[PDB]
């Protein structure tokens with residue numbers, strides 16, 4: 712049994728809700744929240760922008776030190792950093808950004824990072840300002856992630872379309 716409430720169970724391991732990821736993280740304090748990161752961990756907008764704002768920029772400060780030591784992530788890659796006031800840990804995952812021309816086949820590689828964590832609160836990778844089709848992102852998620860994932864959908868309209876169209 713876990714703390715997650717109000718989620719629509721899609722498969723054995725994937726759940727979905729219309730929820731504010733910051734507000735959901737603040738309520739649950741999950742072991743892992745996933746950030747929709749870029750390779751530079753520059754948390755300017757979308758999921759990263761919102762999560763980082765909710766940490767009062769502490770996520771960005773920590774991320775800048777990570778990059779100064781390690782250099783950029785790979786598209787499809789990830790790193791584990793603090794969850795600050797939102798979670799124990801933040802898994803920063805880089806999905807391909809279609810608005811930069813990145814290979815959408817890297818979306819599966821991005822989701823494979825979730826399998827290193829037994830339970831996660833996450834957004835749909837490469838959705839929103841990363842430019843991918845969120846229906847496609849949900850399909851790759853269900854077909855890739857084997858651990859228990861609780862997906863927070865930012866839009867009520869999009870949430871209803873994802874559920875209604877789910878095979």
Ligand SMILES: Cc1ncc(C(=O)O)s1
Pocket residue numbers: 732756757758761834835838839840864865
């Ligand atoms: C505050 C948020 N902005 C974008 C989200 C998303 O595309 O998942 S959540």
